[PDB]
Amino acid sequence: SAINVMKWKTVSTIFLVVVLYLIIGATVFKALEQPQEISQRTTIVIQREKFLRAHPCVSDQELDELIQQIVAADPLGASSNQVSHWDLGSSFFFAGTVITTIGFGNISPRTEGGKIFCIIYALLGIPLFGFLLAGVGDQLGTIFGKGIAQTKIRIISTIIFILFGCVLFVALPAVIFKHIEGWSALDAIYFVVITLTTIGFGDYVAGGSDLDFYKPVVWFWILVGLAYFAAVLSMIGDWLRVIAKKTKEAVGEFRAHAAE
Amino acid sequence: KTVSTIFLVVVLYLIIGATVFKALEQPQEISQRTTIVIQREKFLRAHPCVSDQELDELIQQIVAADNSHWDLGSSFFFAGTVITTIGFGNISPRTEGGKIFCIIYALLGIPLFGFLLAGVGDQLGTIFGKGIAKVEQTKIRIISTIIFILFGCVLFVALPAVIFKHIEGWSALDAIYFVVITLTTIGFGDYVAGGSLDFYKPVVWFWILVGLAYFAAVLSMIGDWLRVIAKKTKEAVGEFRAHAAEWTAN
Ligand SMILES: CCCCCCCC
Ligand SMILES: CCCCCCCC
Ligand SMILES: CCCCCCCC
Ligand SMILES: CCCCCCCC
Ligand SMILES: CCCCCC
Ligand SMILES: CCCCC
Ligand SMILES: [K+]
Ligand SMILES: [K+]
Ligand SMILES: [K+]
Ligand SMILES: [K+]
């Protein structure tokens, strides 16, 4: 049971590194988001007061319960007639979000039957889509293997892999998203990263804004791009332990010599 | 590539799910969307000083309000959602540098968290191994897997959902719904435990840490069950065609 002691040491150290990494990212995001927050938090109260004052004739407090009744929309007399969010197409993009575990959450089920089905549908879809993604990844890895046909040559081959990768699966689809969805250059690249890393905040969605040839390419862009980041995230993880183990040899060697 | 036709089965599984969700969600959509129209007209008539016009400006500036959070701790939990690939989206980055940092922070954190979760999973798999090597011939393997899934759904689904039901104010289904959506790394964000003061939220993120390793094992077994079912349906298709050809010969 000595190897179990050796495992628990490594596990606890990784968890201490993860916490540090989380603390670092925490401080950086809040040092990047708190400023625009407080500006918006004060300029929304300016608009509250300047439209309570212009119209004190509401039962003034209901503005806040009104806003609550509007955060439930999370309509107007103009275009009181819309299209669905669970139409013949969006439900098949939402079934895709469930099995891919990207879960943008822009439209989530509200029926108890829908919630229970979504649970069973995920528990069966996540493994099934895993076999699909594995088959697609093996297929594309052999397409790359055919096209690439000692250690220095294989580093060059990994470089040209990552290059065509960001070209086909990052550059081109982001430009397509920038064109049709009307996003910026960063918003497109941000959307590509958040989608194919299976994070999917839902702040940007390709099928959210209201050609029907658009989407069949989207979910099958998503399918193959997931195989791509799967390889890329695996290479990044491999890079992390190589750096991690050689920083461990350097610290042990640093300490040991102690400037002679 | 004949095996790679799983694609087509996945597309069916999607088309099937599609027809089910629109048969489960588009109805109440209409009920909700017609009960919103009634509310608006109930607000212009009941408040005649507010006109058609002031309402539109109000709705616009609140849809803009859709775009305290990022506090000393909520940014830590955002980072937790980033590396776990759960990404509730309840609080998303808006700064240009915040977006780029979020990109880089994910590309580097997701592998790191993968190593952590792998270490926690191996550690918990051996903790499980100690208990079951004691409680646990060919048939017994099924009972052992039953005891795994049974006692795991207790610790990582039942008990934390009851905790969420009481404390967070959800239903039994909303709790179980949240548990699955979270620990399957899907995370729509419709329900978030700490999305709606340093003790409820770290206990959850430690739960999340260990429950992810739990569903990871559960999802892998289910995939293995699917593999067994698929091979045994293939051998049954070969049986059916073989005797159907037998019969045609007769
Ligand atoms: C990002 C942290 C770098 C050092 C890792 C922890 C060293 C103990
Ligand atoms: C005991 C192992 C510590 C490793 C820290 C590495 C920092 C880059
Ligand atoms: C859930 C039922 C799917 C039908 C099985 C597919 C056999 C080719
Ligand atoms: C190859 C046949 C797939 C059957 C899947 C059924 C899962 C309920
Ligand atoms: C409430 C149960 C709904 C059934 C969906 C398969
Ligand atoms: C040590 C097991 C914890 C289950 C929640
Ligand atoms: K998500
Ligand atoms: K989300
Ligand atoms: K994952
Ligand atoms: K995921």
Ligand SMILES: [K+]
């Ligand atoms: K996700």
